[PDB]
């Protein structure tokens, strides 16, 4: 059970699922939280970062020590910086200039080179700058479901995940529906020629207030400390769980750890 590997990237994935025992009413289905912050980069985005780079390698678009440019932000940026370092690639991350000095310290610690774009232009601005760098320098610019089946075994009634996890949802769903034909999949979002409906059955909207409440509660009562998007998923999972009722099972994705959001109002206290 104690494992030995050749690279930290091999640690990405196979995240554990923890059954909730206190914040769930006696009437609800059982709720399980898959902790993606258990990834080496501490977020579900370690997965997409690894996948992006492995696709580039498989496609012969990358050779040892090559430079890769990528317009990115948030947890995906951290994931790419870590993966690039472990793989030996030189990462040039084009990111909206909205992060703190310490975040830049983190990214640079992995050897990533940062190119900061206008904060007000968001990703569009980053994307534009990256395409610019490519034309000037010629830089190269480029499992969750399986794990869930293994962990949930023969039964899973509902799957819940934030829209911030994007393709993770999209990809895990194909596996889940095949293992659990009757499963319902819900995409969770901030309150703020046949159609394919396979990605999700319904959208669940959660207010920042509801999100804060759920994350604070799970942290206090279960010792599970997630970020804001995590509180939203928890609230959604509890909601769905109440409708399903006893004997049923719900699993939700916890994308990141609260330790990365201590400067936000999430765990802000009076003093």
TrEMBL record:
One of its GO terms (biological process) is cysteine biosynthetic process from serine. Its cofactor is pyridoxal 5'-phosphate. Residues 8-255 form the Tryptophan synthase beta chain-like PALP domain. GO terms for molecular function: cysteine synthase activity. Its EC number is 2.5.1.47. Keywords: Amino-acid biosynthesis, Cysteine biosynthesis, Pyridoxal phosphate, Transferase. Belongs to the cysteine synthase/cystathionine beta-synthase family. This is Cysteine synthase. It comes from Geobacillus kaustophilus (strain HTA426). The lineage of its organism: Bacteria, Bacillati, Bacillota, Bacilli, Bacillales.
């Amino acid at each position: 059970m104690a494992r030995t590997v050749n690279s930290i990237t091999e640690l990405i994935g196979d995240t554990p699922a923890v059954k909730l025992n206190r914040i769930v009413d006696e009437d609800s289905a059982d709720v399980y939280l898959k902790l993606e912050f258990m990834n080496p980069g501490s977020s579900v985005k370690d997965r997409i970062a690894l996948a992006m780079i492995e696709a580039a390698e498989k496609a012969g678009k990358l050779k040892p020590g090559d430079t890769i440019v990528e317009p990115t932000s948030g947890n995906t940026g951290i994931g790419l910086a870590m993966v690039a370092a472990a793989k030996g690639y030189k990462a040039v991350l084009v990111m909206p200039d909205t992060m703190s000095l310490e975040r830049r310290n983190l990214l640079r610690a992995y050897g990533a080179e940062l190119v900061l774009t206008p904060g007000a232009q968001g990703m569009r601005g980053a994307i534009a700058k990256a395409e610019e760098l490519v034309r000037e320098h010629g830089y190269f610019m480029p499992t969750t479901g399986k794990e869930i089946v293994e962990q949930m075994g023969d039964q899973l009634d509902a799957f819940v995940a934030g829209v911030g996890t994007g393709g993770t949802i999209t990809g895990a769903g194909k596996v889940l529906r095949e293992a659990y034909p009757n499963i319902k999949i819900y995409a969770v979002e901030p309150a703020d020629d046949i159609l394919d409906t396979s990605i999700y059955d319904g959208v669940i909207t959660v207010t920042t207030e509801e999100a804060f409440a759920a994350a604070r509660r799970a942290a206090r009562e279960e010792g599970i400390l997630g970020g804001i998007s995590s509180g939203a998923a928890i609230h959604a999972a509890l909601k769905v769980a109440k409708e399903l009722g006893k004997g049923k099972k719900v699993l939700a994705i916890i994308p990141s750890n609260g330790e990365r959001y201590l400067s936000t109002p999430l765990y802000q206290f009076e003093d």
